[PDB]
Amino acid sequence: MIVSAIAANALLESVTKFHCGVIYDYSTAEYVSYRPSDFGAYLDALEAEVARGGLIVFHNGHKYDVPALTKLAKLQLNREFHLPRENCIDTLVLSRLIHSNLKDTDMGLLRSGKLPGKRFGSHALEAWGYRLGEMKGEYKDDFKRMLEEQGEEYVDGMEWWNFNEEMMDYNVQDVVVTKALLEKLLSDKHYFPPEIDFTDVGYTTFWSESLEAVDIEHRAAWLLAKQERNGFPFDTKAIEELYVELAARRSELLRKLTETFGSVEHVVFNPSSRDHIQKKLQEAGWVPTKYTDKGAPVVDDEVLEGVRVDDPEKQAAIDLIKEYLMIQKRIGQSAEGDKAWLRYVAEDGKIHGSVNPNGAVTGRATHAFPNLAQIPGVRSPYGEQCRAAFGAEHHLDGITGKPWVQAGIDASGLELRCLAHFMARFDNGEYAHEILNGDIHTKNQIAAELPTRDNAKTFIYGFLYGAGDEKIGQIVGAGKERGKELKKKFLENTPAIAALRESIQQTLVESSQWVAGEQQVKWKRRWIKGLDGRKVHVRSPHAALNTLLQSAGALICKLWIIKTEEMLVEKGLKHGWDGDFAYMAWVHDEIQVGCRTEEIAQVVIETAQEAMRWVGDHWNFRCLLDTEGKMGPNWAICH
Amino acid sequence: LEESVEETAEDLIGLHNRVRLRQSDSLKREIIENGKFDQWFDELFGNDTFHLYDSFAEAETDRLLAKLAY
Numbered sequence: 017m018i019v020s021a022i023a024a025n026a027l028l029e030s031v032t033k034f035h036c037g038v039i040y041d042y043s044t045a046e047y048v049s050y051r052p053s054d055f056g057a058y059l060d061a062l063e064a065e066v067a068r069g070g071l072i073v074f075h076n077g078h079k080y081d082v083p084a085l086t087k088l089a090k091l092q093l094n095r096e097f098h099l100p101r102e103n104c105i106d107t108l109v110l111s112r113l114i115h116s117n118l119k120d121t122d123m124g125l126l127r128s129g130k131l132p133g134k135r136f137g138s139h140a141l142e143a144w145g146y147r148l149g150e151m152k153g154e155y156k157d158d159f160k161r162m163l164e165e166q167g168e169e170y171v172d173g174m175e176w177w178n179f180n181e182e183m184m185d186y187n188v189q190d191v192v193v194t195k196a197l198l199e200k201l202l203s204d205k206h207y208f209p210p211e212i213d214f215t216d217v218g219y220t221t222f223w224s225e226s227l228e229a230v231d232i233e234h235r236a237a238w239l240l241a242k243q244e245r246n247g248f249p250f251d252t253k254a255i256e257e258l259y260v261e262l263a264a265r266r267s268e269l270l271r272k273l274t275e276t277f278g279s280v281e282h283v284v285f286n287p288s289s290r291d292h293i294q295k296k297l298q299e300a301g302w303v304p305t306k307y308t309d310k311g312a313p314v315v316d317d318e319v320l321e322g323v324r325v326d327d328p329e330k331q332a333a334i335d336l337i338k339e340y341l342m343i344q345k346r347i348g349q350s351a352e353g354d355k356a357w358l359r360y361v362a363e364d365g366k367i368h369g370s371v372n373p374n375g376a377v378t379g380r381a382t383h384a385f386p387n388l389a390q391i392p393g394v395r396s397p398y399g400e401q402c403r404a405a406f407g408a409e410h411h412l413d414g415i416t417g418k419p420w421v422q423a424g425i426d427a428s429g430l431e432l433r434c435l436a437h438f439m440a441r442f443d444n445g446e447y448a449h450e451i452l453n454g455d456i457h458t459k460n461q462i463a464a465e466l467p468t469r470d471n472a473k474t475f476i477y478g479f480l481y482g483a484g485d486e487k488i489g490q491i492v493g494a495g496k497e498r499g500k501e502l503k504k505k506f507l508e509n510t511p512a513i514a515a516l517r518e519s520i521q522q523t524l525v526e527s528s529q530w531v532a533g534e535q536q537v538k539w540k541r542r543w544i545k546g547l548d549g550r551k552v553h554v555r556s557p558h559a560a561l562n563t564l565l566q567s568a569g570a571l572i573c574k575l576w577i578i579k580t581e582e583m584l585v586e587k588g589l590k591h592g593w594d595g596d597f598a599y600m601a602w603v604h605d606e607i608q609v610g611c612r613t614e615e616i617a618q619v620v621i622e623t624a625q626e627a628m629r630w631v632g633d634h635w636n637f638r639c640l641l642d643t644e645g646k647m648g649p650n651w652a653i654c655h
Numbered sequence: 656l657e658e659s660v661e662e663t664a665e666d667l668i669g670l671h672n673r674v675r676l677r678q679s680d681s682l683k684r685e686i687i688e689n690g691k692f693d694q695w696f697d698e699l700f701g702n703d704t705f706h707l708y709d710s711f712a713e714a715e716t717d718r719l720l721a722k723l724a725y
Binding site for chain 1: 680681685688689690
């Protein structure tokens with residue numbers, strides 16, 4: 017096993033030259049420094065560890081270093097350099113896996129003055145250097161301040177434009193923290209058994225003697241990084257053709273929304289910022305019902321629908337304000353935002369939405385710049401146009417010239433089937449078969465005694481995730497009276513659910529106690545074992561069920577999207593826009609895959625189902641898992 | 656006679672390590688391909704004491720006693 021870290025000129029988008037890199041070998045126990053002319057020998061040293069069957073240690077390498085060394089080897093040395101997924105490890109991913117609960121713990125470390133406040137939550141190398149006491153100095157701050165005082169300002173990352181002997185030394189600095197962070201993660205025996213020294217083993221042994229989550233996470237981070245580089249094809253013109261129709265609607269409404277009113281001070285107010293609707297409704301005679309913790313009256317979509325005033329003009333204007341705020345939201349996400357979609361469209365015509373894998377307590381990843389996991393759906397206004405802008409048809413084939421086709425496959429009722437799995441231990445697969453028998457929402461309706469099946473649908477998820485008795489009662493238009501009795505009745509007709517909280521409470525935990533209206537829910541065990549065996553720190557026993565199921569559901573999907581692509585590669589298909597298919601977006605339980613021909617998409621749909629059954633078989637799931645696929649051009653059709 | 660030599664060994668292997676390598680199906684594929692199979696195997700049969708019969712193709716009486724005597 018070898019440990020390394022590199023230095024380039026810029027980020028993955030416009031990286032052109034390799035500066036330096038250091039490789040510490042655990043067999044030689046000595047560092048090796050490389051320089052911009054030693055780039056060729058650097059690639060050889062990594063291949064040697066691949067030839068021996070060892071491992072290559074990078075921090076943020078699965079997302080940056082390894083694909084950059086793939087990109088840099090093509091334009092500088094004109095050689096193909098690709099590190100296999102099996103013999104490369106990313107400490108950054110392990111950090112997000114092993115120590116998802118650390119800050120948290122860092123509160124005392126933050127109070128200590130040992131850990132910078134700007135690195136409060138970062139799994140980055142610099143954030144870890146102070147934690148290990150190996151930070152002798154940061155190259156990010158020792159350059160910026162030198163730009164102010166020693167002449168000539170700067171804008172965004174210029175400390176990498178060219179090599180310097182201080183960079184060569186801070187490249188070493190990045191390596192020794194990477195080594196020490198690796199050993200800090202290998203010393204956690206919940207994932208890495210003590211009987212095996214993972215610092216001196218082959219790649220075949222490393223994955224197998226480690227916890228299953230360790231293997232998945234490196235497969236997951238590698239896969240999702242490909243999706244980011246795959247990107248989501250984007251019809252720029254279409255969103256532009258909407259900003260015109262919305263800004264005109266905003267401008268025409270803005271003109272009309274100054275026709276009803278009517279305002280050391282001046283006056284110009286328009287529908288935005290809490291001092292707007294609050295200032296006019298308190299002139300149309302509106303008495304606020306629900307307030308907030310700061311004192312200000314609640315002005316959300318809920319209360320606005322019920323705002324009734326004696327003034328017909330003011331009343332009819334409410335619906336005009338309702339439209340305005342919604343117009344700004346779509347505009348503020350697709351055009352008028354700091355993270356607007358139009359700003360992230362690269363030169364290829366695709367949006368490369370980033371994704372932080374299991375760097376999210378339990379399961380589903382986090383998406384940003386832009387958040388691909390909050391594009392308005394087809395059921396919301398103007399969402400049909402929005403979802404249509406994210407489609408494989410917006411990327412023509414680099415060869416045939418044909419518009420690619422999109423395949424949308426989701427996990428059918430993943431949440432309740434995960435629930436059926438943990439409660440099949442007490443009812444002997446009763447609830448699990450009710451899923452297969454169909455209409456589980458009909459049975460939950462009878463079990464909880466609800467008037468409509470839709471009332472059962474909104475009940476089962478809220479109840480499972482720790483909802484009050486008021487909120488449950490508000491489903492049928494009541495309060496905690498009907499709420500308490502609705503939940504207690506559901507528990508009596510579904511014994512297994514209550515018995516599930518026995519096995520969980522008998523795992524074991526502590527005991528709780530109420531003191532005069534304060535929830536003092538303590539606990540002894542604040543970590544649930546997952547399906548892959550990882551620690552899921554969860555929260556208080558007040559809910560926890562939601563975390564257990566969502567951990568189950570999202571970890572299933574992680575293996576699901578991994579096994580599908582492995583089978584697609586196994587079946588012979590090629591991943592990448594120069595191949596046959598490309599992962600575009602992963603949303604909780606659904607994924608969007610670009611496909612060169614409709615025929616390829618059909619195999620994808622079948623393959624996705626085959627992987628979902630293999631996952632269910634692998635972990636011996638007590639309930640049956642299934643998926644449904646939809647073929648089409650864009651996202652509005654595949655969902 | 657009613658099971659291949661690998662199946663009787665399979666029972667012996669699990670039996671030695673106080674486990675059942677016939678019901679835990681995820682664990683079967685895991686511990687074998689990881690390096691715990693080779694560990695137990697040398698731990699058990701390494702003394703060159705265990706001998707089995709391999710056929711399942713209906714042995715004859717004096718096509719068994721000959722081998723049993725062997």
